[PDB]
């Protein structure tokens, strides 16, 4: 049972114009990203030792309210 944790972009990064959302997660696992409920596939980069990172421009991040990390449990956060 993986312990999932999701993180919003830091103010420091946002100041530079970028927006990365980080998610920390038997090896077999599948991570799904959701922005306001619908699946997002472009801009995702994964790493296994699991960690999933969704990078977007600040403008895009600012376009939505909810970011969800969905494993194979659901964890998320609303910008507002």
């Amino acid at each position: 049972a993986p312990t999932v944790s999701i993180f919003p972009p830091s103010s420091e990064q946002l100041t530079s114009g970028g927006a990365s959302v980080v998610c920390f997660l038997p090896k077999d696992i599948n991570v799904k990203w959701k922005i306001d409920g619908s699946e997002r596939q472009n801009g995702v980069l994964n790493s296994w030792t699991m960690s999933s990172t969704l990078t977007l421009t600040k403008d895009e991040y600012e376009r939505h309210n909810s970011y969800t990390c969905e494993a194979t449990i659901v964890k998320s956060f609303n910008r507002n």
Binding site: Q13, G18, S20
Partner: protein, 81 residues
């Protein structure tokens, strides 16, 4: 060569912490927490490496210490609520 930008990873006001190391080149990078945990392998995009590292444990303090030998650069980002 390019030193990395280190970004704090704190929960979204709603315990695991972490740090995000974006756009450095080349490898490797050393990551420790308050010099005494999961450091994921880097990914290479656009000729820059990105990596992340978490730690499970505001009263007490936590600070990730990231070092990038190549550019003789250090960074120690405290994680704030």
């Amino acid at each position: 060569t390019t030193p990395p930008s280190v970004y704090p990873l704190a929960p979204g006001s709603a315990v695991t912490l972490g740090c995000l190391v974006k756009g450095y080149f080349p490898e490797p990078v050393t990551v420790t927490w308050n010099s005494g945990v999961h450091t994921f392998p880097a990914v290479l995009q656009s000729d820059l490496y990105t990596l992340s590292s978490s730690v499970t444990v505001p009263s007490e303090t936590v600070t990730c210490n990231v070092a990038h030998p190549a550019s003789s650069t250090k960074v120690d980002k405290k994680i704030v609520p």
